[PDB]
Amino acid sequence: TETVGKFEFSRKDLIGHGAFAVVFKGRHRAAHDLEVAVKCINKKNLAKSQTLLGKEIKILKELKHENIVALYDFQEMANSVYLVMEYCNGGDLADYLHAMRTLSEDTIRLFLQQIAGAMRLLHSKGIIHRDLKPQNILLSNPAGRRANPNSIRVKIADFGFARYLQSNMMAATLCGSPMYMAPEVIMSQHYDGKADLWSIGTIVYQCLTGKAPFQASSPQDLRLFYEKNKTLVPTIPRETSAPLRQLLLALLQRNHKDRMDFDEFFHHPFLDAS
Ligand SMILES: O=C(NCC(F)(F)F)c1cc(-c2cnc3[nH]c(C4=CCCNC4)cc3c2)cs1
Numbered sequence: 001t002e003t004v005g006k007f008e009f010s011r012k013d014l015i016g017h018g019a020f021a022v023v024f025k026g027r028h029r030a031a032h033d034l035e036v037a038v039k040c041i042n043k044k045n046l047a048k049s050q051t052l053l054g055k056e057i058k059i060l061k062e063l064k065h066e067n068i069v070a071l072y073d074f075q076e077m078a079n080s081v082y083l084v085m086e087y088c089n090g091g092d093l094a095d096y097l098h099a100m101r102t103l104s105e106d107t108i109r110l111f112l113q114q115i116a117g118a119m120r121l122l123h124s125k126g127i128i129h130r131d132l133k134p135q136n137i138l139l140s141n142p143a144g145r146r147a148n149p150n151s152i153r154v155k156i157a158d159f160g161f162a163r164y165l166q167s168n169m170m171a172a173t174l175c176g177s178p179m180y181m182a183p184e185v186i187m188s189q190h191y192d193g194k195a196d197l198w199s200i201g202t203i204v205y206q207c208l209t210g211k212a213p214f215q216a217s218s219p220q221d222l223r224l225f226y227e228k229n230k231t232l233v234p235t236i237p238r239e240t241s242a243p244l245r246q247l248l249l250a251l252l253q254r255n256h257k258d259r260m261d262f263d264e265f266f267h268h269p270f271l272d273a274s
Pocket of ligand 1: 015016017018019020021022023037039069085086087088089090091092136138157158159
């Protein structure tokens with residue numbers, strides 16, 4: 001077994017992986033019931049995985065929120081870097097959607113309330129995430145892994161692509177998952193924090209209908225569709241409540257200049273308790 005500080009983990013206990021990171025289940029060496037997730041280098045992309053893991057450490061040191069994955073400890077050295085992070089017994093949102101197929105509007109509202117709270121911190125600190133997708137949304141249920149989805153706590157994870165963006169500046173780095181990036185990102189244009197809001201609206205749309213709002217065969221086909229259609233019409237089912245209808249239509253705007261902003265997102269009537 002491998003040790004990182006006061007924690008230990010074993011490979012082949014894989015609970016998550018990406019192109020630039022690998023995640024294993026772990027535990028405190030003294031308190032074995034204390035579960036943690038140890039994030040390590042993906043050896044397939046050694047040099048970049050180191051850099052992205054180091055950047056995530058610097059970002060998460062400043063982002064402490066109940067709906068953001070906690071960073072208990074870390075270990076940066078010349079040739080390796082490790083992150084001892086919060087473990088979530090519910091898994092990621094992608095696995096939950098693969099099992100539930102669709103979520104109730106009340107469940108979406110509960111999830112969106114927590115995401116909006118986390119995004120409120122990111123926005124106030126001037127940080128954009130740039131990799132928001134169900135795989136990077138973690139679920140934690142304190143009443144048991146099979147308890148009521150009304151008591152689920154949601155945590156945003158994977159901050160390796162995150163960056164500070166000054167309020168009068170635009171970003172231009174191409175990162176994230178093509179299905180979830182805003183049109184301006186995939187079309188190689190400048191973008192700001194409103195790109196994350198498109199990703200969130202895409203996630204909310206997927207939780208509602210079980211599918212992505214804008215289908216495509218490949219990333220190149222998706223960007224050609226975004227190019228060809230100067231306006232975007234997301235099909236919203238008839239049973240959708242009116243507050244959720246306006247939230248999705250304003251989040252899934254093609255032009256970021258027309259897209260919903262943060263202040264109107266943080267106080268949207270759909271988030272208001274029913
Ligand atoms: O950054 C991250 N992921 C991006 C990338 F690219 F690295 F994958 C992080 C992911 C986690 C984390 C925390 N808790 C977890 N639980 C489970 C369970 C799976 C099935 C059985 N039920 C529980 C998975 C899981 C992952 C911390 S960080």
